[PDB]
Amino acid sequence: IFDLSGRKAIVTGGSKGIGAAIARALDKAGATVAIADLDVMAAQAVVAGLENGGFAVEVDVTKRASVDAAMQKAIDALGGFDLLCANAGVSTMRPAVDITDEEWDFNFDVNARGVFLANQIACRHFLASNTKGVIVNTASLAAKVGAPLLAHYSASKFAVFGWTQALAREMAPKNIRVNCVCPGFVKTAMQEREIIWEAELRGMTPEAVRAEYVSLTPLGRIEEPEDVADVVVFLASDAARFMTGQGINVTGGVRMD
Amino acid sequence: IFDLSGRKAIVTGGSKGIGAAIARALDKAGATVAIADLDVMAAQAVVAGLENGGFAVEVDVTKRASVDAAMQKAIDALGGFDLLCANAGVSTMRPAVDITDEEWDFNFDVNARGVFLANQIACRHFLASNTKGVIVNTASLAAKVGAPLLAHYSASKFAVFGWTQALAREMAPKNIRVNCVCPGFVKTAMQEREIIWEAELRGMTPEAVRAEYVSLTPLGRIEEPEDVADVVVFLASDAARFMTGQGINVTGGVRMD
Amino acid sequence: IFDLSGRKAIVTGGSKGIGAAIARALDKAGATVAIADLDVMAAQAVVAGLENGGFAVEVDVTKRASVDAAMQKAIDALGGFDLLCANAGVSTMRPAVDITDEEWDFNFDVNARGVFLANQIACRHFLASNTKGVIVNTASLAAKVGAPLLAHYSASKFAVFGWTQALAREMAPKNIRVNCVCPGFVKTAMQEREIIWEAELRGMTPEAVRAEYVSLTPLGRIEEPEDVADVVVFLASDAARFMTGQGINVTGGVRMD
Amino acid sequence: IFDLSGRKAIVTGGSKGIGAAIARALDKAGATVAIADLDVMAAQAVVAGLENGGFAVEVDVTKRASVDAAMQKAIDALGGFDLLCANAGVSTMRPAVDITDEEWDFNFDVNARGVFLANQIACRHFLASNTKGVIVNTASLAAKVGAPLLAHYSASKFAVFGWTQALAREMAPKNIRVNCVCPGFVKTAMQEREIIWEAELRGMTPEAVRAEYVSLTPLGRIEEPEDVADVVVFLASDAARFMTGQGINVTGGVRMD
Ligand SMILES: NC(=O)c1ccc[n+]([C@@H]2O[C@H](COP(=O)([O-])OP(=O)(O)OC[C@H]3O[C@@H](n4cnc5c(N)ncnc54)[C@H](O)[C@@H]3O)[C@@H](O)[C@H]2O)c1
Ligand SMILES: NC(=O)c1ccc[n+]([C@@H]2O[C@H](COP(=O)([O-])OP(=O)(O)OC[C@H]3O[C@@H](n4cnc5c(N)ncnc54)[C@H](O)[C@@H]3O)[C@@H](O)[C@H]2O)c1
Ligand SMILES: NC(=O)c1ccc[n+]([C@@H]2O[C@H](COP(=O)([O-])OP(=O)(O)OC[C@H]3O[C@@H](n4cnc5c(N)ncnc54)[C@H](O)[C@@H]3O)[C@@H](O)[C@H]2O)c1
């Protein structure tokens, strides 16, 4: 029941970080994966290590024409389409009173609009092929608890979750499932950037900010991309066949719902 | 104690519906109100009825320069500034697969960006004047439960709530409180449009749709703007002095948190 | 609309702390208050200072016969019954692996059973008289987030919240509202004592424990009973007429729902 | 990462319904399972069919002496102990004003106390043997939303979730995870019973009550035990290694968190 053999997957933002771990895990579980990413060279590198082969395609998830074209190219390459993991996201950090319109839009356009477009287009394909498709979106701990210095980011990730819920309600009568995962403090390049921004803004060392994240975590350690990826495999699989519209926390006990 | 005597309030989207009720209720409680709205003449008519006088100013909450200018004009007119109720909002209704970018941006730019802008600018003012300012944002039941045919609207209202939480956390050390309210099925012009849109989309009469809303409401009646307004007064007031970052449900029992 | 003039209230556990503050606030707002408490001398001490008179009655909220008789005596004394504030509660702090059955039962029977009996009997009274009755139960932050060292306490307070929601659903069609309040870190005369015990269990000093509670509170201070009581006034009043089944956080930003 | 090969499990309430499906699914995934149930005849019948051996033991989860003896007997039979699924539960349906003390106690003693005892004793064992132990408790949709006619049942299931969260926070530093699953409208004998009671209390047919549950489920069918059991497998597994303190909805989209 956890097997993804034969399934055809697209992972947006799959070149690096959590997305790459998702792609690797989906593949380990039996799927054939297309990675759509701003960095198509990094996508090809990930594909090189997948067991079932795969495909790399360039996409800018902020732009409808790009997402439409990327998705169609991936679907054509895969020879079908069963699963979307919409993972592309960004952050900037800033005191709320100083957030710029530019970075409000950067966060919204990638995190919320990028999920919208990939999801909307995915569902169009699923419906046109009468597929029991499955969507997993990457939200955040900040889709559950507003985070200081990330107020715009939090807003954008709450938007993901709300979109997820509503979409799920529309797609469930069509046997299309839509869920999201809410990671905690994940060791990737987004975290390494964040610790340095945060330390500066709070006047702390990077090391102390890190240690605070671990102190907040009941399981006692910083999170890895794989911690999230293995949960996305679950939500993609038929073990989760009676689950839709959820924001599954994968945070080590930080956030309980 | 629920008195707002001597407090200086700005209500965005106060010309009509919930915002007009909020303006009347704040004024009944002792505040002097400035209404900032697209519809300046309707705002002026609400102001005409208020006990403590007040001011009406044109604003388009989607635009930073407009919000900056309208807030400054209001604060100048009021002679101070203690309370922002950011209420302006819009909706469209569409199957998720058919949502346009135009209507995605219309919902986000008013609902989410407009709150952002009014709040951020309010907080700059409060901090510059050393005022223990208070914010009440109007979210929605759709900030708690994703609603079908309103997937983009829901996402935008989730974003309000996430923004509210994160700002509350930043503002709390400054003794500035930020909360939102989440109304249910409130009988305003927006309800009248939605009833019609939903009737159109589901092949029902608008009256049957409205009756279904009441059937879904434990307290057994359609909601009034005043149902909401009296809770905004509470949240504005010092009775709510130890409450910040909440999404207070005012739905007649439809949603419980 | 926030006035309780003419209303007749019963407060269980009104002798001390949050309950005493509730009784004093209800009275200030216009109500006539009966306090039902295990310590009737301490109840009478609170009644002595109230503006609108009132009545003190012995009760053991763990026993149905006691609650029925106290409630009946109180209603008789008041000449009516509009409002129940079910506040009686207890806690013991213990590592989860060392919780005794006695401590489990103590917590459940007072906190969860006590609310059940008082609420059930109140509702029987309201329904028999066709009264638009209101209930405010005192839950806890630990009804929202389970708390280490308070695992049985948390379970009991989650139960209060679930009870509140279900009862509210049943009662709403009969024009009876049922809400709860979820206080945070409240300074009562008992907390000197429960802080030393926590400090002992955690290998900290009492000072360090109290300071940590402040640190953890966005609004920057320990909570007072009055912070809660004023929100209870609101929930009792017709300002909250369109709210039912809620767990209203009064935590200074610690918990956001 | 989803394999439970070699692991030793105890399922309380595993004789029929959801519990039996849990016990089957854990076994299919590679575990050896002991079932502890009030009906040991039925438990033995399930155990007889398991691939990996197993053990049936009689338990009354409402009694500490019973739980301690049954768990020790199981652990001795299994030769180790890695996993507890505390599933035993009961319900009765009754209007909230008519709930008896006897049925309040029945619901609490099984549902909440029985999880407390099983979990507490399990953790004692895990800690003594330095075991990375895992607990999955069976809560309910009614741990998330209070259910009319089930107010006592809801309160007991809220308790299970709150216990789960608090215990998770205490156990997380010791490498022990504690989660719960919240099933929706699952077709078992609890449902066949309830459909009848509810139909009588509401003046409806049993068929119509069941139809109403389907109507309320976005995925559009009544839930099966296996829908729940497969998620339990996931939570038991190392795929869920960075998840603790959660109430995972398995409701077909009825409740989203
Ligand atoms: N690191 C964390 O703690 C954390 C926590 C919660 C959520 N998340 C979320 O997880 C997801 C991935 O985070 P990460 O930490 O792995 O970050 P990352 O910066 O490691 O990776 C981001 C990926 O998204 C792609 N991307 C960015 N903008 C894009 C665009 N416009 N079009 C297409 N692809 C684009 C990048 O090229 C990259 O492969 C994001 O949604 C992020 O918000 C991260
Ligand atoms: N009616 C409901 O059931 C309902 C439910 C939940 C939330 N809401 C929310 O409550 C708020 C008020 O809604 P309502 O039902 O009273 O709607 P309404 O249409 O009666 O009033 C909307 C007000 O917002 C103003 N407005 C719209 N866009 C604006 C802009 N760009 N700049 C300035 N002013 C603008 C309008 O001119 C109008 O005065 C909105 O945020 C809405 O999303 C309404
Ligand atoms: N719709 C549903 O059926 C539904 C929904 C949500 C939750 N649940 C929960 O799922 C769990 C199983 O429900 P089910 O529908 O499979 O019910 P069931 O009535 O079919 O099975 C109950 C099981 O628990 C056992 N049990 C009862 N009292 C016990 C005691 N004192 N000690 C030990 N064992 C005891 C029984 O012998 C039986 O094996 C329960 O916790 C129940 O509350 C069921």
Per residue, the 3-state secondary structure of C65-133, as one string, reads HHHHHHHHHHHHHHCCCCEEEECCCCCCCCCHHHCCHHHHHHHHHHHHHHHHHHHHHHHHHHHHHCCCC
CA of A89 to the centre of ligand 1 (A): 4
C-alpha span between B246 and B143 (Å, rounded) = 12
For chain C, positions 122-181, list CB contacts with chain A under 8 A.
145-146
Q: Considering A153, A158, A185, A234, which one is annotated as catalytic? A: A153
Find the ligand nearest to A139 CA.
1
**B51 part of contact set with chain A, CB < 8 Å:** no
Q: D151 contacts in C (CB within 8 Å)?
A: 162-163, 166-167, 170
With H, G, I as helix, E, B as strand and everything else as coil, classify residue D199: helix
Sequence letter at residue D198: E
Which ligand 2 atom is at minimum distance from the Cα of B16?
A: 39
The candidate with the shortest Cα–Cα distance to B7, out of B133, B144, B137, B129, is B133
The answer to whether the Cα torsion of C71, C74, C79, C81 is positive or negative is negative
User: Which residues have C-beta within 8 Å of that of residue A249, sequence separation ≥ 6?
Assistant: A141, A144, A182, A184, A255, A256, A257, D243, D246
Residue of D nearest to A174 (CA): D219
C-alpha span between B254 and B218 (Å, rounded) = 6
Residues, chain D: 257
- Among D169, D227, D239, select the one facing A218 at the smallest CB separation: D169
DSSP-assigned letter for residue A141 = G
Extract the tokens encoding B96. Answer: 């998720």
Sequence letter at residue A137: N
Go through A90-119 and write b for each residue having 16 or more CB atoms within 10 A of its CB, e for each that does not.
Answer: bbbbbebbebeeebbbbbbbbbbbbbbbbb
Burial class (CB in 10 A: 0-12, 13-18, 19+), C97: middle
User: Which residues have C-beta within 8 Å of that of residue D240, sequence separation ≥ 6?
Assistant: A230, A231, A234, D177, D179, D234
Extract the tokens encoding B130. Answer: 């050393």
Question: Going by CA atoms, what residue is nearest to atom 38 of ligand 1?
Answer: A13
Chain CA centroid to CA B38, Å: 14
CB B166 within 8 A of CB B239: no
- Give strand pairing partners of D34: D10, D55
CB atoms within 10 A of CB C179: 25
Q: What is the DSSP string of B209-225?
A: HHHHHHHT-TT-S-B-H
Residue of B nearest to A113 (CA): B104
Element (H, E) at C171: helix C151-171
The answer to whether the Cα torsion of A157, A158, A164, A167 is positive or negative is negative
Residues, chain A: 257
Burial class (CB in 10 A: 0-12, 13-18, 19+), D202: middle
Hey, are the CB atoms on B242 and C252 less than 8 Å from each other? yes
CB B115 within 8 A of CB A127: no
C-alpha span between B25 and B19 (Å, rounded) = 10
With H, G, I as helix, E, B as strand and everything else as coil, classify residue D237: coil
- Among B228, B233, B253, select the one facing C244 at the smallest CB separation: B253
Q: Is D59 left (phi over 0), alpha (psi -120 to 50) or beta?
A: beta
CB B7 within 8 A of CB B82: yes
C-alpha span between B47 and B49 (Å, rounded) = 5
Residue D256 phi/psi, 5-degree rounding, is: -120, 125
Resolution (A): 1.7
Question: Going by CA atoms, what residue is nearest to atom 41 of ligand 3?
Answer: D89
User: Which residues have C-beta within 8 Å of that of residue C256, sequence separation ≥ 6?
Assistant: A145, A146, B165, B168, B245, B246, B247, C249
C-alpha span between B239 and B252 (Å, rounded) = 22
C-alpha span between D89 and D19 (Å, rounded) = 10
CB atoms within 10 A of CB A65: 9
Taking CA atoms, C170 is separated from B217, B220, C166, D180, in Å, by 12, 12, 7, 27
CB atoms within 10 A of CB D65: 9
CB atoms within 10 A of CB B102: 9
Taking CA atoms, A80 is separated from A7, A137, B121, C231, in Å, by 8, 20, 49, 57
DSSP-assigned letter for residue A175 = T
- Give strand pairing partners of A37: A58
Extract the tokens encoding A190. Answer: 């987004």
C-alpha span between C252 and D12 (Å, rounded) = 40
Kindly calculate the radius of gyration of chain A based on its CA atoms and give it in whole angstroms: 17
C-alpha span between D171 and C120 (Å, rounded) = 36
With H, G, I as helix, E, B as strand and everything else as coil, classify residue A173: helix
With H, G, I as helix, E, B as strand and everything else as coil, classify residue B147: coil
What is the nearest CA distance from B249 to chain D, expressed in angstroms? 15
- Give strand pairing partners of D29: none
Extract the tokens encoding B146. Answer: 């994703």
Q: Considering C153, C158, C161, C163, which one is annotated as catalytic? A: C153
Angle at D163 between CA D161 and CA D166, to 5 degrees: 110
- Give strand pairing partners of C134: C83, C177
User: Which residues have C-beta within 8 Å of that of residue B48, sequence separation ≥ 6?
Assistant: none
Element (H, E) at B177: strand B177-183
Sequence-separated contacts (24+) of D66-71 with Cβ below 8 Å: D67/D36, D67/D114, D67/D117, D67/D118, D67/D121, D68/D121, D70/D36, D71/D10, D71/D36, D71/D118, D71/D121, D71/D122, D71/D125
CB atoms within 10 A of CB D76: 12
Strands (E), B62-164: 83-86, 134-138
Q: B256 contacts in D (CB within 8 Å)?
A: 145-146
Angle at B47 between CA B41 and CA B48, to 5 degrees: 90
CA of D49 to the centre of ligand 3 (A): 20
Side by side, the strands of the sheet bearing D134-138 are D55-58, D32-37, D8-12, D83-86, D134-138, D177-183, D247-250
The candidate with the shortest Cα–Cα distance to C217, out of A51, D53, B168, A17, is B168
With H, G, I as helix, E, B as strand and everything else as coil, classify residue C162: helix
Taking CA atoms, B75 is separated from B8, B84, D186, in Å, by 8, 11, 58
Between chain A and chain B, the number of residue pairs with CB atoms below 8 A apart is 132
Q: Which fold has domain C1-257?
A: Rossmann fold (3.40.50)
CA of B138 to the centre of ligand 2 (A): 9
With H, G, I as helix, E, B as strand and everything else as coil, classify residue B90: coil
Residue of B nearest to C230 (CA): B239
Between chain B and chain C, the number of residue pairs with CB atoms below 8 A apart is 119
Establish whether residue A238 lines the binding site of ligand 1, counting it when its CB lies within 6 angstroms of any ligand atom. Answer: no
Which ligand 1 atom is at minimum distance from the Cα of A88?
A: 24
With H, G, I as helix, E, B as strand and everything else as coil, classify residue C138: strand
Taking CA atoms, C217 is separated from B168, C196, C229, D140, in Å, by 12, 20, 19, 32
**B219 part of contact set with chain C, CB < 8 Å:** yes
The candidate with the shortest Cα–Cα distance to A145, out of A157, A135, A127, is A157
Establish whether residue A61 lines the binding site of ligand 1, counting it when its CB lies within 6 angstroms of any ligand atom. Answer: yes
> Is A213 a known active-site residue?
no
Sequence letter at residue D61: V
Where do we find the tokens 């939090």?
A154
- Among B172, B251, B257, select the one facing C219 at the smallest CB separation: B172
Burial class (CB in 10 A: 0-12, 13-18, 19+), D221: middle
Angle at C229 between CA C228 and CA C230, to 5 degrees: 95
Element (H, E) at D1: none
Sequence letter at residue A22: I
Burial class (CB in 10 A: 0-12, 13-18, 19+), C204: middle
With H, G, I as helix, E, B as strand and everything else as coil, classify residue B41: helix
Extract the tokens encoding A169. Answer: 């309600």
CB atoms within 10 A of CB D174: 14
Establish whether residue D15 lines the binding site of ligand 3, counting it when its CB lies within 6 angstroms of any ligand atom. Answer: yes
Chain CA centroid to CA A136, Å: 7
> Which residues of D are catalytic, by number?
153
CB atoms within 10 A of CB B49: 11
User: Which residues have C-beta within 8 Å of that of residue A4, sequence separation ≥ 6?
Assistant: A26, A29, A30, A31, A83, A233, A236, A237
Question: Going by CA atoms, what residue is nearest to atom 7 of ligand 1?
Answer: A140
C-alpha span between C118 and C111 (Å, rounded) = 11
Which ligand 1 atom is at minimum distance from the Cα of A61?
A: 32
C-alpha span between D72 and D81 (Å, rounded) = 10
**B257 part of contact set with chain D, CB < 8 Å:** no
User: Which residues have C-beta within 8 Å of that of residue B245, sequence separation ≥ 6?
Assistant: A146, B164, B165, B167, B168, B169, B172, B178, B179, C218, C253, C256
Taking CA atoms, A24 is separated from A189, D3, D232, in Å, by 18, 18, 24
Hey, are the CB atoms on C218 and B168 less than 8 Å from each other? yes
End-to-end alpha carbon distance in chain C = 25
Extract the tokens encoding D13. Answer: 């309430």
- Give strand pairing partners of C83: C9, C134
Burial class (CB in 10 A: 0-12, 13-18, 19+), D39: middle
Contact residues of ligand 2, CB 6 A cut-off: B 12-13, 15-19, 37-39, 59-62, 87-90, 110, 138, 140-141, 183, 185-186, 188-191
CB B45 within 8 A of CB B16: no
Q: D104 contacts in C (CB within 8 Å)?
A: 113, 116
- Give strand pairing partners of C33: C9
Largest CA distance in chain B: 55
The candidate with the shortest Cα–Cα distance to B110, out of B246, B19, B175, B217, is B19
C-alpha span between D67 and D59 (Å, rounded) = 6
Strands (E), chain D: 8-12, 32-37, 55-58, 83-86, 134-138, 177-183, 247-250
Sequence letter at residue A11: V
Q: A256 contacts in C (CB within 8 Å)?
A: 145-146
DSSP-assigned letter for residue C240 = G
End-to-end alpha carbon distance in chain B = 24
Q: B245 contacts in C (CB within 8 Å)?
A: 218, 253, 256
What is the nearest CA distance from A167 to chain B, expressed in angstroms? 6
Extract the tokens encoding A146. Answer: 């507003």
Question: Going by CA atoms, what residue is nearest to atom 20 of ligand 3?
Answer: D17
Q: A253 contacts in D (CB within 8 Å)?
A: 168-169, 172, 244-245
Chain CA centroid to CA D113, Å: 13
Hey, are the CB atoms on B167 and A157 less than 8 Å from each other? no
Establish whether residue D88 lines the binding site of ligand 3, counting it when its CB lies within 6 angstroms of any ligand atom. Answer: yes
Q: D118 contacts in C (CB within 8 Å)?
A: none
Find the ligand nearest to B14 CA.
2
Extract the tokens encoding A157. Answer: 């990730």
Which ligand 2 atom is at minimum distance from the Cα of B109?
A: 31
Question: Going by CA atoms, what residue is nearest to atom 3 of ligand 3?
Answer: D186
H-helix segments, chain A:
17-28, 40-48, 64-78, 101-107, 114-129, 151-171, 189-202, 206-215, 225-236
C-alpha span between A11 and C10 (Å, rounded) = 59
With H, G, I as helix, E, B as strand and everything else as coil, classify residue B107: helix
Element (H, E) at A147: none
C-alpha span between B163 and B159 (Å, rounded) = 6
Taking CA atoms, B171 is separated from A184, A209, B174, C253, D169, in Å, by 23, 20, 5, 10, 28
- Among C64, C146, C161, select the one facing D166 at the smallest CB separation: C146
Taking CA atoms, A245 is separated from A158, C135, C254, D217, in Å, by 13, 33, 27, 12
The candidate with the shortest Cα–Cα distance to B98, out of C193, C132, A217, A170, is A170
Residue of A nearest to B97 (CA): A120
CB D112 within 8 A of CB D156: yes
The candidate with the shortest Cα–Cα distance to A247, out of A110, A144, A150, A171, is A144
Half-sphere exposure of D166 (CA within 13 A, CB side): 33
The answer to whether the Cα torsion of B6, B8, B11, B15 is positive or negative is positive
Establish whether residue D59 lines the binding site of ligand 3, counting it when its CB lies within 6 angstroms of any ligand atom. Answer: yes
End-to-end alpha carbon distance in chain A = 25
CB A168 within 8 A of CB A185: no
C-alpha span between B186 and B176 (Å, rounded) = 29
C-alpha span between B145 and C211 (Å, rounded) = 37
